[PDB]
From a paper:
Tetrameric streptavidin (T-Sav) has been popularly used, engineered and evolved for hosting reactions that are mediated by biotin-appended chemical catalysts.
Although it lacks the subunit interface and shares moderate sequence identity with T-Sav (55%), M-Sav has high affinity to biotin (KD = 2.8 nM). Catalysis by 2 in M-Sav was mildly improved (20% 1,4-addition product, entry 2) but there remained a substantial amount of the 1,2-addition side product (7%). The melting temperature of M-Sav increased significantly when ligand 1 or 2 was included (+20 °C) as assessed by circular dichroism spectroscopy, implying its binding to the biotinylated catalysts. We began by testing the monomeric M-Sav as the host; the reaction lacks both enantio- and regioselectivity despite numerous optimization attempts, and protein X-ray crystallography analysis revealed that the catalyst is solvent exposed. Replacing Tyr111 with other residues including serine, threonine, valine, lysine and alanine did not improve the conversion or the regioselectivity (entries 3–7). Glu120 in M-Sav : 2 is in proximity and spatially corresponds to Leu124 in T-Sav : 2. In contrast, the monomeric M-Sav contains a solvent-exposed site and was found to be a poor host for iminium catalysis.
Author numbering: 23 to 137
């Protein structure tokens, strides 16, 4: 249980932010705001849901809200590092229906509580 430490506002290297509540039971809930240049569904909140087990975290965002539907979703999997300069290091998949078949994009996001 990395509850009090995970809970808060985070920023990745693309300038995207999420705000999350980590319950004692391991529920992750909150909102994600994408600001990655050239992508869809930016600058409005999307629902974040996921699960954590100690330092091990996973959450997903469906890119559909009352503002914009990008017919896609992302899952993040990684580890929380507490203490001075606390970090969430993640691998993500961004999946959607491509022209020929199911698409997957892959990347790494590094999250800090520094704005
Ligand atoms: O472009 C999108 C939806 C927005 C994706 C934002 C990505 S998720 C991983 C990375 N981290 C972050 O903070 N922002 C980016 N969806 C569709 C449009 C057409 N094909 C994918």
């Amino acid at each position: 249980s990395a509850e009090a430490g995970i809970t808060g506002t985070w920023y990745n290297q693309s300038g995207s932010t999420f705000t999350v509540t980590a319950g004692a039971d391991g529920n992750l809930t909150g909102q994600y705001e994408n600001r990655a240049q050239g992508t869809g569904c930016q600058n409005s909140p999307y629902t974040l849901t996921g699960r954590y087990n100690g330092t091990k975290l996973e959450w997903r965002v469906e890119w559909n809200n009352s503002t914009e539907n990008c017919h896609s979703r992302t899952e993040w999997r990684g580890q929380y590092q507490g203490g001075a300069e606390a970090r969430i290091n993640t691998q993500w998949n961004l999946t959607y229906e491509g022209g020929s078949g199911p698409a997957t994009e892959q990347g790494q996001d590094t999250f800090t509580k520094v704005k």
